[model samples]
Target: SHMASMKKKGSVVIVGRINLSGDTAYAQQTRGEEGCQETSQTGRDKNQVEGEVQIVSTATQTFLATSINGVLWTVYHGAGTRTIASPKGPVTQMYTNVDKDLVGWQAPQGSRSLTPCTCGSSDLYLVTRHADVIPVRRRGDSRGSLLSPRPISYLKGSAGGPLLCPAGHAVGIFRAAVSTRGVAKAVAFIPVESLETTMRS
Candidate 1:
């Protein structure tokens, strides 16, 4: 199943906590957490972030993440390469979009990378909190931006997750949802192209 594969490949529900005061947001590997069954095992399950990239946005969403304001972040896959928290002096902040609430973090030099979606493939999925991978539809008129998918009631803690393509490429970063009452009506995300353009500039 893609759900299982994505968890290992790049979409594992990253448990632990990150702090905002540190040089970089940090979290520990959750191995025995509830709802994160894949995390219960120490083998095959992994989490990763795009490295050597600078992410800038508005002041409202520009702050770093604080995992309980204490724990540090670590990156490791099936390989023996493991990197602890790295200084932010290396990765530069390119630009800030004042009109939008953009939040992104810088990864260490050795961190793994995922391909951004080009809006070519239709098969897409969103990895929610606790590692729930749900099928999401891409709007026909969308240039890989606004997506109106079925309402997801559990959008809480889902923000900042990845919207992945069938081939496991990341298409969008979950931002927010339009909701009637409490259930979401449509989901809005930052297109991968948008991030790529900013990173390049």
Candidate 2:
């Protein structure tokens, strides 16, 4: 009976991590320090940066985003703390990089197998930042666990977005938008099963 409620609330959300304290002065100071690597004061907190995030499961609040975001989280996690934000509010969670180009973290909650009901039908939506939903088509079969969605134009900066099915289930995470010979072709995404395996362990 409550499943209908799921439709009203989308699990897909944009996750972001930013350094609130670090700035360029720190970077220049670190560079001038002699034998900085050998010093116990590595000053990891002094590196200021910002990047993207994606949520794979609302149940555990698991996240999947770029490896850079994973590294940012890992680095900031060591210094002090970082926050994962969504439209609802700040998630206030920790994230771990489980694989290259994949980050896993537990809601602080929390896809399916990622197989769509039908690839031919136009029932896919790519949820980008600012809650913008863009229609996309599954252009081809899975290539080494990466799904190719056609017509990836206007998908820039949407790498960490979720690919939702008609029923509002997240079936894939948008990984990249590619072009061959300077022609924008398709987007490559990792199936939700990849994260499912990570969650099991």
Candidate 3:
């Protein structure tokens, strides 16, 4: 049954976690559900994007980017390739050691904030599930529940999506989730600060 195993329903869902210093964030995953199961063994899931020029970093990881001045900026999530058509025909770039900054990145001016949550407030990260805008609870550590509140895993194809905060800003991107006793209790994400710094280097 679906309850016994995890599968991608559509868009890979997002999960997040923050480091002790609160300067960086990491993705949280539960039973590998964030990555589409279709390409788990191969690390290349074609169904990841509804439609696009397309690129894949892993069975469950896909990267999104923004174009600036004359360069493209994106998080170094994983290694993958894309064949861009040109007058010379088509060109493909296969990335490696993504988080290592082989390529570079930068966030748009004022598009993000270094601090996601403060010492005391009521705002939380939000996402869409089953047509519902679900506000996730943050643990100060910068993560949401990956615990198993239920028996089945269902959020799919939401991975790499934006982690929208209460002040109308994106603090980071969803990365992973976790589960306990068939109920998801935590979420992991790559923080905006981390993404900007890592990709910029």
Candidate 4:
């Protein structure tokens, strides 16, 4: 299968190991519940730094991407830690489901073999334009899937931030109830330019 093959191919290590609690000057200050309870200007910065550390720690684990129910979910090897140049927001747009029109609307050959798009089963699809290709996994049962009534749209978080495309573009949409296991999938992406416009709006 494509997913299996891709998994075998190995993924790039984008983020490396990070120390959530390092020897920084603020580490000792933010140690316990009392520290957490205290809220002040200085405490706020400490909290923010700790939050950033946590985000980087989680982001670093994502080595590749996966799709569930037309949404995107980044895949990581195990529970590892890493630092990010820019701290991600509390609500990060991680996954999205793409509309079938955007992804060519046809299941690539071989999808039916692994798992047919049954009434309640989801299927994966891909969108390719030029050299760029985006993968979207349709969610819901076969009959009431995201592709049945409406074209799947990109996923957005509370902050309305766009999901990140592999090419650094943010052209993606969201699909709900895409995963049976409860892990949201990121299936499609919008062009980066369109995503930027949406963010601005």
Candidate 5:
């Protein structure tokens, strides 16, 4: 995905990695918390930047966007991270990218398969976890095997960051990365193929 924005401290690298105590600079920046804590400053800077696109899905979250036939879209999470409806919020759609589609409400075509060039999964693709791009990669030269454990960690706030295959194609939405009993395992993600066009306006 092509994101346009400036980079700030802490947000450059995502959480996860051993002995991170030595990485005080990044630690200080992110403070070990995840999510869009920095970008949405101003209680909501919907128009803070010039020529920048804003899609405030809710007061605290923005939709994860993708495209279908050139129309911008996002994969809407059901109720998001909240366990109960917000007394002051319960966003169900977007206000920006008004002409976008909802991936969960559309069928993902196999032809949209993201293909990483030659090196297979190891072929590096920069992940735009936010509005700017940062380098990320897979460990194995295969699909699915590399999302978790991440080969590299994806920003916790970027759970839905769209990853690219070679040729500007798209892949799975980065979901989550974790350790079970001390072993880093597969990153949780929703493959593009998993979403379906089943709902409507």
Candidate 6:
């Protein structure tokens, strides 16, 4: 006997702006058509970037943008921006943890922890999918949905690939996937406030 379950699917797309020489803004887009069948398994699906943005600013140093899927998700620091704060060399000395200093990190009681962490001595606290934000399901459902655009996981990697938000903050560090639980998923984002302070300091 053979039987199949009937279900509908949802779609999510990502787009961003790139700056050359840290001054000019370029636009890019990526499409994800591979929808999941089960809601609980939605996080298992992959998200892709479709278009491309160019960079043009020599003094700009970084690029920033936010996500636009019902909620605001910003990603920046593509090829155009320079990796000033890194883990090992030149950029390593600038790392700092100022979560206590940012007003946004001090939300009222019962609020979630959005404060970014200082990775060792590096100025950039690598951005990954918040563990709390994951395994997320559609409004009223308990199971995961593949059609849903659940944020993937993240991991540590090279310096220049970090994603910066529009608030002059580092939202997510760029890394590659190593495994189901070990890889750095591309959708991982960091708190913009943490990034903003890092840039200022």
On lDDT, the candidate that comes out on top is 1
- In candidate 6, stretches whose alpha carbon ends up further than 4 angstroms from where it belongs are 1-92, 98-156, 164-171, 175-189, 198-201
lDDT of each: 0.41, 0.38, 0.38, 0.24, 0.32, 0.25
Q: What is the C-alpha lDDT profile of model 5 across 1-201, one tens digit per residue?
A: 445676422111112211112322121122123333432222221211111111223334433334333222343341132211111222223222212222321112221223322333433333433443433455432223332343333444444445555544444454445446544454444444433222213
Residues 1-94, model 4: lDDT tens digits: 5765562111111121112223431212222333322221121222322211111112212222222232222222221111111222122233
Q: Pick the candidate with the highest TM-score.
A: 1
lDDT by residue for model 1 (1-201), tens: 666556322122333322212354333332234424433233233344333111211112211121101111111111112112222212222234433444333443334455665657766676554445567776542223224444455656556556678876777666667677666656666666666665565
Query: TM-score: which is higher, 1 or 4?
Result: 1
- Each candidate structure's TM-score, on Cα atoms with residue i matched to residue i, is 0.50, 0.42, 0.44, 0.22, 0.38, 0.21
Q: Residue 159 of model 6: what lDDT?
A: 21
Which runs of model 5 end up more than 4 angstroms from their true locations? 1-57, 70-126, 131-154, 180-185, 196-201
**Candidate 2 vs. true structure, TM-score:** 0.42
For model 2, the local distance difference test gives 0.38
Measured over all alpha carbons after superposition, the RMSD of each candidate to the real structure, in angstroms, is 15.3, 16.5, 12.8, 19.7, 13.6, 20.0
lDDT value, residue 102 of candidate 6: 15
* Model 3: per-residue Cα lDDT over 49-129, one tens digit each: 111111223344544332222222333443233322222322333322344322222222222223333334324553422
Which one wins by TM-score: 4 or 5?
5
Q: With candidate 5 superimposed using the best TM-score fit, by how many Å does residue 123's alpha carbon deviate from the native?
A: 4.8
Q: What would the per-residue lDDT of candidate 2 be over residues 1-201, giving only the tens digit for each residue?
A: 677565322222222321112331111111222322212122222222233232222222323342221221221112123333332343443444434244433332221122333333435666553345556666654221123433434555455556666665555666666666544455566555554554455
